[PDB]
Design a protein around this ligand. Structure first.
Ligand SMILES: O=C(O)CNC(=O)C(=O)O
Ligand SMILES: O=C(O)CNC(=O)C(=O)O
Ligand SMILES: [Zn+2]
Ligand SMILES: [Zn+2]
Lengths: 14, 340, 340, 14
């Protein structure tokens, strides 16, 4: 449950 | 409702900042994003509730308001800058690391590293010859910038934004993206997984935001596809057969000019366009990792939490199947005649 | 291909064990399951590869071949036995713990605990009055059985089946289910998450198996629904609009009689019917936990591993969303216009 | 990956 909700940090930057 | 509202009047009776004809025409309705002073408690309430707001008087990037191409070329140093080139006004972002998963993907825009003076020259050359090519410089600020730009960066309103970071429990600043675009350039609709203070410096940008609960109307690409987090819908020619719920989308919009700061909350879709015939635009953004997930998860879940669940399911499946291409077929098998 | 083949001849010129008219008529084709001696290396190869096979000479339950209602009533003791009752020939299994999730589910069969002598009486009563009611006794054997049944149980061929367990790396024996049914009773298609040696004692049963890779043709209920692991398709009246790929299903079938043992491999769908006008049937099954998942997962994955992945995705979503009812809507949102 | 493939043990027995 806590594992699934964990957010990422990806943004539009190469 | 009204879009960006009646254009504002520039001080000193210098006329409207823009007019309706500089905005592109789209099929969906929009309502205005509020424009408030940073001392307004309503503004604090909106940021606290992760809703967008335009702050008019932060002085966040006050020393950068004098920036233009001549100044930047003289002082931004001799580092490399990522410059995207496209034969269309739409600059769709793609993750180059994920292009191995999808061999049949051919991006429309192209990234070329170059020195800032080479970037100015290209724009100058294109303008001189009346070419249809378009450029968009998108480079994160780093220690290589010249001494003048350092002093400018040091002069940003760190007092104010550091207080925001602490009040909201956000993580640390991850980067500042310098965005220099041509009139009419468009960054198509997408969401980012970080909190964003979007600081406008030169020219005007029209920003259209959609809340995370409109995920089902905006059809992002698969998480393993290079255009992860970007909408599949072509706003200029929406395919309602493939994307039927795009007929129900509703946005929030505003036009930001020099000195304005737009809070784009994490997970909120945003479409950003430099006004037609408005000249070049300059923006610097500030990205902060979101606050940690609370230890006691509280139900009902918020929309962005459901987005995060869907992303993780997709990620886990790709790893467990050993190939991203099999994700779709397995998901289809899972729901067909069972959940649909 | 041929179904159960030309019926076998009973020793002593006692005639065909059964005839074609005692089998129900279905819309799909079938091929035969092989009937082999336990000393045949081909049989070992099939079990090793988790494919079904009928073993004709195991003597697995040799002492139980004398069992009938009179003997069992006299000796099976005075424990409670679960007896299901239905107004149809189909006895669809439902998990009573999951019925809280789905309030709109009303099972067709009903479970009543009773003593074995009360079960015999009910059958006797029904037969006497020509009633259309049907009963199916399904009870796991336990320490309460009488001394005669203990001696019989002790006389099973533990030497042979313990060797199988070790050779296959299976877990421990979890239970033996005693199955006593009326002529014509049907257990609809489903899969079990354990390995099964299915030991026929009295009467004849037609067993139709489908490999795990026919998941997409058999449309199991949602994992949180009470009928988890059972096919949604009504074999007697298939709804091809809801279940189109049931038009592509292909099974393996056989008819087992007294002394036969059918290996039903874990995850294989099986539909089991007591032959029409064949009298009562008696079966005892042996269930073993499957072998552990190998530490080095090997690609490509097997069909049953993909089934296990789908089950876990469904389970995790139900827990993370806090409600099983929201699983469907989220999965649909995930694939619509994205993966389908 | 190993967590997803883990099998259960449910059978038709009440
Ligand atoms: O300004 C643009 O064209 C695009 N900017 C962003 O998407 C952002 O700052 O997150
Ligand atoms: O015999 C029946 O009617 C049903 N038996 C089973 O499903 C089994 O043994 O796994
Ligand atoms: Zn963005
Ligand atoms: Zn079964």
């Amino acid at each position: 449950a806590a594992l699934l909700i964990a957010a990422g940090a990806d943004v539009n930057a190469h | 409702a009204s879009g960006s509202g009646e254009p504002r009047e520039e001080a000193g009776a210098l006329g409207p900042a823009w007019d309706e004809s500089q905005l592109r025409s789209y099929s969906f309705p929009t309502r205005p994003i509020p424009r408030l002073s940073q001392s307004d408690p309503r503004a604090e309430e909106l940021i606290e509730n992760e809703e967008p707001v335009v702050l008019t008087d932060t002085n966040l990037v006050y020393p950068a308001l004098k920036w233009d191409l001549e100044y930047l070329q003289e002082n931004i140093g001799n580092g490399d800058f990522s410059v995207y080139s496209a034969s269309t006004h739409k600059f769709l972002y793609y993750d180059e690391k994920k292009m191995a998963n999808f061999q049949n993907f051919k991006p429309r825009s192209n990234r070329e590293e170059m020195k800032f003076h080479e970037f100015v020259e290209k724009l100058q050359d294109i303008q001189q010859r009346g070419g249809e090519e378009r450029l968009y410089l998108q480079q994160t600020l780093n220690d290589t910038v010249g001494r003048k730009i350092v002093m400018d960066f040091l002069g940003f309103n760190w007092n104010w934004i550091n207080k925001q970071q602490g009040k909201r429990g956000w993580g640390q600043l991850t980067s500042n993206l310098l965005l220099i675009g041509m009139e009419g350039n468009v960054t198509p609709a997408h969401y980012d997984e970080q909190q964003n203070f979007f600081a406008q410096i030169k020219g005007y940008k029209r920003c259209i935001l959609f809340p995370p609960d409109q995920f089902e109307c905006l059809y992002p690409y698969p998480v393993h596809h290079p255009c992860d987090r970007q909408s599949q819908v072509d706003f200029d020619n929406p395919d309602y057969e493939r994307f039927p719920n795009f007929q129900n989308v509703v946005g929030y919009e505003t036009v930001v000019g020099p000195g304005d700061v737009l809070y784009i909350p994490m997970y909120w879709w945003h479409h950003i366009e430099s006004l037609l015939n408005g000249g070049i635009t300059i923006t610097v953004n500030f990205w902060y990792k979101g606050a940690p997930t609370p230890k006691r998860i509280e139900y009902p879940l918020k929309a962005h939490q459901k987005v995060a669940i869907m992303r993780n399911i997709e990620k886990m499946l790709g790893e467990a199947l050993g190939n991203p291409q099999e994700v779709g077929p397995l998901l289809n098998t899972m729901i067909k005649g069972r959940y649909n």
